[PDB]
PDB file of C-alpha atoms in Angstrom:
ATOM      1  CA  UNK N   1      32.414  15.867   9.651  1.00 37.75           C
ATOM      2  CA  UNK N   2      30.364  12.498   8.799  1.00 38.16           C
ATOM      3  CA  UNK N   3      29.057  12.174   5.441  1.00 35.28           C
ATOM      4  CA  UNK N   4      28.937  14.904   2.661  1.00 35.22           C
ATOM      5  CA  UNK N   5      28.298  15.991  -1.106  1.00 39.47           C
ATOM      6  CA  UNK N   6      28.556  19.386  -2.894  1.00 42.18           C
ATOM      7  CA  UNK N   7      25.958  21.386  -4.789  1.00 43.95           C
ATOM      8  CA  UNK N   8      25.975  24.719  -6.688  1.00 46.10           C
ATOM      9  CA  UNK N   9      23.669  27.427  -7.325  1.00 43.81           C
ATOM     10  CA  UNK N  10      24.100  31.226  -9.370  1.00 42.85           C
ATOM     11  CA  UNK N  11      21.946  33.887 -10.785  1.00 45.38           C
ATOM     12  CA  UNK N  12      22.905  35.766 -13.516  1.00 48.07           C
ATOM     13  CA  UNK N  13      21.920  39.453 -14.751  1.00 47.80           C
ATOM     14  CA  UNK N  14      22.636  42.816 -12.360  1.00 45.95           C
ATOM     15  CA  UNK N  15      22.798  41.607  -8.953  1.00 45.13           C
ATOM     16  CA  UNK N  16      24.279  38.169 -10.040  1.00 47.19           C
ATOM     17  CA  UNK N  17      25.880  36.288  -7.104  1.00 48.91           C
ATOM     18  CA  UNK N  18      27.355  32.645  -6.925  1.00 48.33           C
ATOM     19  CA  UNK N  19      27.179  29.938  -4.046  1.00 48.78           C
ATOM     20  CA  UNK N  20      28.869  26.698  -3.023  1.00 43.69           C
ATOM     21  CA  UNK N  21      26.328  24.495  -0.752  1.00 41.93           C
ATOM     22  CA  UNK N  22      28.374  21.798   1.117  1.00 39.62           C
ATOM     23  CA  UNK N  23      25.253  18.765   2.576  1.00 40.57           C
ATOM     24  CA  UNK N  24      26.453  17.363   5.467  1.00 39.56           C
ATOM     25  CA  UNK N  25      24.774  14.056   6.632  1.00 40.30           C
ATOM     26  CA  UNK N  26      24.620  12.677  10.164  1.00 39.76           C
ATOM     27  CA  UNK N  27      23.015   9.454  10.155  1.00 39.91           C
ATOM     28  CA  UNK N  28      20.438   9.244  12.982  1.00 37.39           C
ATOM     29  CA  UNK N  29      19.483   5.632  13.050  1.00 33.96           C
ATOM     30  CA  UNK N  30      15.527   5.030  13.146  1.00 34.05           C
ATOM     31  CA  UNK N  31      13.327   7.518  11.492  1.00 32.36           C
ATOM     32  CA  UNK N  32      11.603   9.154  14.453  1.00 29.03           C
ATOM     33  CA  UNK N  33       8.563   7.903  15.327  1.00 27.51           C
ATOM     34  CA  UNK N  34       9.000   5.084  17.086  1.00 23.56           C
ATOM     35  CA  UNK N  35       6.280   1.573  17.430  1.00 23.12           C
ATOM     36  CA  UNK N  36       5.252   3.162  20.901  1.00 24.26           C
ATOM     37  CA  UNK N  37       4.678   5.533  19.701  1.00 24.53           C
ATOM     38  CA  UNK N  38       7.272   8.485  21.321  1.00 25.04           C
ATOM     39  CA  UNK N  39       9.084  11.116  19.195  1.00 22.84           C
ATOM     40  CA  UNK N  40      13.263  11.090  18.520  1.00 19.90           C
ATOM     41  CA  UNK N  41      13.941  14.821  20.069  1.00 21.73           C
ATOM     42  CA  UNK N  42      16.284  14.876  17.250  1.00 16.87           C
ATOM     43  CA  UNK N  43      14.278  15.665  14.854  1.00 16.63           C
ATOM     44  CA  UNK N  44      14.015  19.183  14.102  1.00 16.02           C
ATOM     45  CA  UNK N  45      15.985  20.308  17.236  1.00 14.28           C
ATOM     46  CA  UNK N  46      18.676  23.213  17.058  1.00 15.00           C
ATOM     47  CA  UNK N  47      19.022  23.890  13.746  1.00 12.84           C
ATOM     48  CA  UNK N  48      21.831  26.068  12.056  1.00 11.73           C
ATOM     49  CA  UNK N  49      22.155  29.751  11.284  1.00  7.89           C
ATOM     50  CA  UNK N  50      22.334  31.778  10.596  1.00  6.92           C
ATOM     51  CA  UNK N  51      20.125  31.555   7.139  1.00  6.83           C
ATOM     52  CA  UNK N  52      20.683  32.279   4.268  1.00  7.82           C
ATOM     53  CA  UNK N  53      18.643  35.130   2.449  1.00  9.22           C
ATOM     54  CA  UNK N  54      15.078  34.347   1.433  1.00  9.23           C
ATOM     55  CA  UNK N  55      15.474  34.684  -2.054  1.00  9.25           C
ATOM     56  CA  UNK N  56      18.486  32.423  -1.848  1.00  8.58           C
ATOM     57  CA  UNK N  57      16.677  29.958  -0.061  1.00  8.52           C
ATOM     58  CA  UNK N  58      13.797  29.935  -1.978  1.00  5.46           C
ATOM     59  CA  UNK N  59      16.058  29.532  -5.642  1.00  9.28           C
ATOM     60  CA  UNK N  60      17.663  26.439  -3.835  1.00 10.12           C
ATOM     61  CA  UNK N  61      14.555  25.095  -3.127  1.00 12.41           C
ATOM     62  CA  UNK N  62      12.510  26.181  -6.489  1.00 15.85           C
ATOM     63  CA  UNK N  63      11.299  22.703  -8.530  1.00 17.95           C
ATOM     64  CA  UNK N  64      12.803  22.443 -11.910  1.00 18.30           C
ATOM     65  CA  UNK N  65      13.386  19.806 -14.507  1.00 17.09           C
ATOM     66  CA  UNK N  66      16.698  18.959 -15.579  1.00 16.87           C
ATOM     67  CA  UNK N  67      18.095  20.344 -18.308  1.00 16.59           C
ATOM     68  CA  UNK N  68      21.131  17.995 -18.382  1.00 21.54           C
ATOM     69  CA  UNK N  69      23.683  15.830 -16.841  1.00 22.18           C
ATOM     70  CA  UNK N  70      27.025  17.037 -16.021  1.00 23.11           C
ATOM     71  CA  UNK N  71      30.470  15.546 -14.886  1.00 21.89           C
ATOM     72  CA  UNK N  72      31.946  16.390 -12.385  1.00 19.69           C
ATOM     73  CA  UNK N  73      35.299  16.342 -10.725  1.00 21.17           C
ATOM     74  CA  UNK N  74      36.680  12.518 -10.881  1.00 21.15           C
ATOM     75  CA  UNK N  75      33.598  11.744 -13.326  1.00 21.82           C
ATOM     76  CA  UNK N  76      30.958  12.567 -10.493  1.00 24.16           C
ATOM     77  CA  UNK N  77      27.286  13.361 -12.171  1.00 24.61           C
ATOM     78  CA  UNK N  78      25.421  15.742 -11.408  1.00 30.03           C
ATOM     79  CA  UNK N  79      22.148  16.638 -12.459  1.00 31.34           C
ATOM     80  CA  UNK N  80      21.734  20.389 -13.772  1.00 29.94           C
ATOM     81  CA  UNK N  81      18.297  22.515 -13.637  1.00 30.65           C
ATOM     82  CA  UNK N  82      18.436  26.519 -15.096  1.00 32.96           C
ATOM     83  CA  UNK N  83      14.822  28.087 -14.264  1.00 33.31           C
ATOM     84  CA  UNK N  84      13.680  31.403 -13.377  1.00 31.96           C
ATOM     85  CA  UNK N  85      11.790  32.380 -10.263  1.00 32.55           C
ATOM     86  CA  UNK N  86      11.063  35.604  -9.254  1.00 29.96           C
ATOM     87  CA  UNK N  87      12.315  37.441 -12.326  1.00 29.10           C
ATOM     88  CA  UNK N  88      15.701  35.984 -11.897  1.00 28.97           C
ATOM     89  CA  UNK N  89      17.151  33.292 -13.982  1.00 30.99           C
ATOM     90  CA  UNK N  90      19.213  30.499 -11.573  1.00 32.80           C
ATOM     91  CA  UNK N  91      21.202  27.932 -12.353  1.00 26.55           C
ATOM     92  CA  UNK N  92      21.572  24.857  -9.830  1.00 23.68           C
ATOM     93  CA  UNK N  93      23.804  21.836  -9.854  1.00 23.62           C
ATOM     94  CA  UNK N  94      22.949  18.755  -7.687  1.00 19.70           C
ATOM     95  CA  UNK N  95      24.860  15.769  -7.118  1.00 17.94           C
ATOM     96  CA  UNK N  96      23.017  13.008  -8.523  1.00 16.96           C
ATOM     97  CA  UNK N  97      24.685   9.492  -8.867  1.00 22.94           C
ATOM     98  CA  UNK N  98      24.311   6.153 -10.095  1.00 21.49           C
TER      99      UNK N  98
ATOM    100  CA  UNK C   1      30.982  34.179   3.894  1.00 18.92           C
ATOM    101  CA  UNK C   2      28.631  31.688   5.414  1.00 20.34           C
ATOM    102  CA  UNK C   3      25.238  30.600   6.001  1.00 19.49           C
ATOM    103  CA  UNK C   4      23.454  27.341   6.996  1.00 17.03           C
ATOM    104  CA  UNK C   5      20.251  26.040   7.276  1.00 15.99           C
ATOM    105  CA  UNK C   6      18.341  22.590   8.353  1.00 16.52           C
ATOM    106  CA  UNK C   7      17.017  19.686   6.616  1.00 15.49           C
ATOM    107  CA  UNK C   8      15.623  16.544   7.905  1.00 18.58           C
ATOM    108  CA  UNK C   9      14.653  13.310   5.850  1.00 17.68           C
ATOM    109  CA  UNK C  10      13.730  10.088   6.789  1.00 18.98           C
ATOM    110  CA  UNK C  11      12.499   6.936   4.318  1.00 19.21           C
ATOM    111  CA  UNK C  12       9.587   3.967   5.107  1.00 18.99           C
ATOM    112  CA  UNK C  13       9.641  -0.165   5.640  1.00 20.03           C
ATOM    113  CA  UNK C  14      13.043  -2.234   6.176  1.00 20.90           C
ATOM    114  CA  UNK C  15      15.774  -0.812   6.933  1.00 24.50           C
ATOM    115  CA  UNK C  16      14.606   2.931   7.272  1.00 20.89           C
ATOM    116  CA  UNK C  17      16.495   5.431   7.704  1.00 20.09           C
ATOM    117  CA  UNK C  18      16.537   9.228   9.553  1.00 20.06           C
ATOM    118  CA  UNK C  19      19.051  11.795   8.672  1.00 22.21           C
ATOM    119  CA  UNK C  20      19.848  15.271   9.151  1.00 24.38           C
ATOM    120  CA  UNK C  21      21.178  17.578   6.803  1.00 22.68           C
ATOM    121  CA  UNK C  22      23.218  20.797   7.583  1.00 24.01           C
ATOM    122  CA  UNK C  23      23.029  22.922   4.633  1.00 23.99           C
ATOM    123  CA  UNK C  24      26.114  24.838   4.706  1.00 21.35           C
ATOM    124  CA  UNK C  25      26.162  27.727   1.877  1.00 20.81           C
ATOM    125  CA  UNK C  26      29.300  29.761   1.131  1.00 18.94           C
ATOM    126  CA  UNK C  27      28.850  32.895  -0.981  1.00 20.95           C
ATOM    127  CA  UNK C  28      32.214  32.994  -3.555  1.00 22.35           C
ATOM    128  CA  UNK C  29      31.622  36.548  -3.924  1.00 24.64           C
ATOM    129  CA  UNK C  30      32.393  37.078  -8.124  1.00 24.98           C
ATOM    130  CA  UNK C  31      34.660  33.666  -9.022  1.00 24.17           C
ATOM    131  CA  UNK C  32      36.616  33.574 -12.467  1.00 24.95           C
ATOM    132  CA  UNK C  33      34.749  33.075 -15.095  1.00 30.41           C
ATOM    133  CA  UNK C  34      35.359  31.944 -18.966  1.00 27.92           C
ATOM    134  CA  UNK C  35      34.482  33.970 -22.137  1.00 29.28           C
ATOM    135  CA  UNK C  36      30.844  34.864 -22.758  1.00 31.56           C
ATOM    136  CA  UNK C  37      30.663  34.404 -18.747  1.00 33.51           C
ATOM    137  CA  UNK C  38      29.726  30.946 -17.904  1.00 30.79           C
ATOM    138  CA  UNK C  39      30.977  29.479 -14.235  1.00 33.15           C
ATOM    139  CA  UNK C  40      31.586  26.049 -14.336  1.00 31.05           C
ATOM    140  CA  UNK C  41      32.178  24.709 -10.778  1.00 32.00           C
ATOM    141  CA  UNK C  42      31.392  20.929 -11.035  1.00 32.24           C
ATOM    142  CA  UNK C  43      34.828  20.918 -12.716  1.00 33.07           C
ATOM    143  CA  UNK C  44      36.714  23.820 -11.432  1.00 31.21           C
ATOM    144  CA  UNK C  45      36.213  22.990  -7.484  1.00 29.56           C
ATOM    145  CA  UNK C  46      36.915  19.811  -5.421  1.00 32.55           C
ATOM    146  CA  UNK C  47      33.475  19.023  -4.129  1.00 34.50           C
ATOM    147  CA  UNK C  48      33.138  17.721  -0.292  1.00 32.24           C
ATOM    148  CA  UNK C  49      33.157  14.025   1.128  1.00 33.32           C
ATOM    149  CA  UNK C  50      33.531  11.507   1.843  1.00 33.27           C
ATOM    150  CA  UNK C  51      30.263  10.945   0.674  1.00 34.87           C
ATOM    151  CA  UNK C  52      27.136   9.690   2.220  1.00 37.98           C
ATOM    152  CA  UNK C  53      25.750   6.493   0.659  1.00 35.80           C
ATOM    153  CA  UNK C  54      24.183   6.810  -2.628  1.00 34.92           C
ATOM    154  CA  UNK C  55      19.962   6.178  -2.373  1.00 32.36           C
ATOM    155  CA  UNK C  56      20.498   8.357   0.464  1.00 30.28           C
ATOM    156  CA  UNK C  57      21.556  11.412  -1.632  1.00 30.99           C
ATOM    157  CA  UNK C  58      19.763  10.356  -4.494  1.00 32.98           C
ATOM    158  CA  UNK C  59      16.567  10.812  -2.494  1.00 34.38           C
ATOM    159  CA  UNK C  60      17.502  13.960  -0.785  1.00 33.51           C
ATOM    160  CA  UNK C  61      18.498  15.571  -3.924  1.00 32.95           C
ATOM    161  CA  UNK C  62      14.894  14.428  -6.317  1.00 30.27           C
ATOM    162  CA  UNK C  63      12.449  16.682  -6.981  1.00 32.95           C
ATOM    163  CA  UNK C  64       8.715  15.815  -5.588  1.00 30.93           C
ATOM    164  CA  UNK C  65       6.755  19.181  -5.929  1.00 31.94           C
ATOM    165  CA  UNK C  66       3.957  18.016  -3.920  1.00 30.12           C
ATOM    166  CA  UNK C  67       3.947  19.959  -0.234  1.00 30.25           C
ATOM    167  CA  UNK C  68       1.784  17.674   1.838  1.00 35.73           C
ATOM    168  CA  UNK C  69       2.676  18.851   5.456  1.00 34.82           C
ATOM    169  CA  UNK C  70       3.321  22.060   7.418  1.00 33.61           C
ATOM    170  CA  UNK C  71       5.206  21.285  10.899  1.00 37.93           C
ATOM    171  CA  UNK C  72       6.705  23.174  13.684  1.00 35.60           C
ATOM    172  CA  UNK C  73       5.683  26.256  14.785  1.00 32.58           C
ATOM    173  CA  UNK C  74       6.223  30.212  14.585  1.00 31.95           C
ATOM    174  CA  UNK C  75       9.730  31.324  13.158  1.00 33.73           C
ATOM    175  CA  UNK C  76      11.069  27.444  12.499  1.00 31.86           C
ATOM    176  CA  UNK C  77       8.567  26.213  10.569  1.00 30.62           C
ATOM    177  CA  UNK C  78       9.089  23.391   8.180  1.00 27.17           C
ATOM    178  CA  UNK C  79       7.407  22.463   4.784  1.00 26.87           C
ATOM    179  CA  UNK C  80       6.975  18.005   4.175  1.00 26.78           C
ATOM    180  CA  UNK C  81       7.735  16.317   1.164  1.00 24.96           C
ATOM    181  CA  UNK C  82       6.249  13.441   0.610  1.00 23.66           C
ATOM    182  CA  UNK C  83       7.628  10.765  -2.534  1.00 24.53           C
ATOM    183  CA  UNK C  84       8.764   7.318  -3.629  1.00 24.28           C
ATOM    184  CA  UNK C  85      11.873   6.473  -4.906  1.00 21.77           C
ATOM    185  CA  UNK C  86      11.540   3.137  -6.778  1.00 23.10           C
ATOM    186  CA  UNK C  87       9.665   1.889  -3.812  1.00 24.32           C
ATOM    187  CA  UNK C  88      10.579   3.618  -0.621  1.00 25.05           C
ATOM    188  CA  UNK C  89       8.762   5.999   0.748  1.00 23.51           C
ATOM    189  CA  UNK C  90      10.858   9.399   2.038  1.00 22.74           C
ATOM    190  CA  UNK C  91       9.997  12.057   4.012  1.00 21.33           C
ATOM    191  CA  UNK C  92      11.656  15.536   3.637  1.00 19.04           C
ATOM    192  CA  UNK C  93      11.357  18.315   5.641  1.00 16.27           C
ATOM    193  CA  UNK C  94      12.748  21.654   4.368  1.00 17.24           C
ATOM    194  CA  UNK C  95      12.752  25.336   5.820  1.00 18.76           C
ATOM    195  CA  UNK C  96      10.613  27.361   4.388  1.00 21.14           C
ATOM    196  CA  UNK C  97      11.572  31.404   4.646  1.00 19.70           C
ATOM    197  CA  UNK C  98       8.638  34.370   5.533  1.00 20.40           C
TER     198      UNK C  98
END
């Protein structure tokens, strides 16, 4: 509802499944820890579920080099990693521009 | 079918900045794919915005490996990132699963 940019992530093999991630951004001003020094309640306060799976998580998460660079609806880049992790082999795209 | 989960990120020095990030992930189920069986999203999908400003997304979408910091407690418990970007110093906090 603010500020936002896509990313994609999929498995393949048995069991394959396929996910859009949609970042939204809310700009909270000062990062929170402030010259006095109090804490922003902000940060880390009611955050959203439900979660996804573990495994899903985890694959989102899991550091990887990048293979490539990919366009991208109205020449947007993105930056692409395909790893495995847990016997799996992912494939992630990230929105990565310049 | 939809899941979401919490980020928070936050850079160093002049003009800092603290954001949150809803991570909102939408499972497509099986989507078309081409011949051998490739997806190719980043060019079949309209991707979300309008989008936040560039370093911003840049920064929360690098890799940086290094965990440096466990915080919060019990069931939300959050893993610290801690990298430069050219520069800047960022923070990220991600959840990390059981």
């Amino acid at each position: 509802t603010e500020a936002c940019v896509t990313s994609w992530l999929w498995s393949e093999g048995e069991g394959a499944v396929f996910y859009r991630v949609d970042l939204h951004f809310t700009n909270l001003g000062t990062p929170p820890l402030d010259e006095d020094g109090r804490w922003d309640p902000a940060l880390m306060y009611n955050p959203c579920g439900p979660e996804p799976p573990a495994h899903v998580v985890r694959a989102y998460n899991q550091p990887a080099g990048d293979v490539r660079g990919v366009w991208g609806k109205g020449e947007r880049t993105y930056a692409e990693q395909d790893f495995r992790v847990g016997g799996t082999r992912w494939h992630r795209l990230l929105r990565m521009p310049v």
